[PDB]
């Protein structure tokens, strides 16, 4: 499978999440995603085929994971935006007020601005601290997906949002959205991963 930020993958033939970013760890191929998407050694499938397994994760507290892929997978420096792509250029963290977009299998590619950093999300499982908040909308299934600026700087991976009964927060004004992502930089240094860029 071609590994592109934002595309769907399943975990143990049951939950769905979205790919965050292609990375490598030495000769190993992988992608970063959200920790709540699977436990260590859970099987990741893309389009019905096994692509790898969860190598490590931390959830709750933090919300991060990376999946190590088989050699057969093609890692790409790109994030899905409809039928087009945004090239990943690096991971400079953007400041509050910066515009950012996110990509995932439920709502597609959505843009907004970063509104606050170091937010705590209180999920049923426990608190997750240190999240950045944006007001781009998102829906159930988008977890793990890419948050990236138009200039191609990877920001982090989708964690959670104030979903309404329709499964997303796209039907409420941007002003009322709290869509949270886990910053990319701590995930890259915690697992010794290098981002695939183009």
């Amino acid at each position: 499978a071609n590994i592109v930020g934002g595309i769907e993958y399943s975990i143990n033939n049951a939950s769905l999440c979205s790919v965050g970013f292609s990375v490598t760890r030495g000769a190993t191929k992988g992608f970063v995603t959200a920790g709540h998407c699977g436990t260590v050694n859970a099987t990741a499938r893309i389009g019905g085929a096994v692509v790898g397994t969860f190598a490590a994760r931390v959830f709750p507290g933090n919300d991060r994971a990376w999946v190590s892929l088989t050699s057969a997978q093609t890692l790409l420096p790109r994030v899905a935006n409809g039928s087009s792509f945004v090239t990943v250029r690096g991971s400079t963290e953007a400041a509050v007020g910066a515009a950012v977009c996110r990509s995932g299998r439920t709502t597609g590619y959505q843009c907004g601005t970063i509104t606050a950093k170091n937010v705590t999300a209180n999920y049923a499982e426990g608190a997750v601290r240190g999240l950045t908040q944006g007001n781009a909308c998102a829906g159930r299934g988008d977890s793990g997906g890419s948050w990236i600026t138009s200039a191609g700087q990877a920001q982090g991976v989708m964690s959670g949002a104030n979903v309404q009964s329709n499964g997303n927060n796209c039907g409420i004004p941007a002003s009322q959205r709290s869509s949270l992502f886990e910053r990319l930089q701590p995930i890259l240094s915690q697992y010794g991963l290098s981002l695939v860029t183009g």
């Binding site: 999300a121 049923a124 499982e125 959670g160």
Partner: peptide
């Protein structure tokens, strides 16, 4: 907010 809920996970996703």
């Amino acid at each position: 907010a809920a996970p996703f």
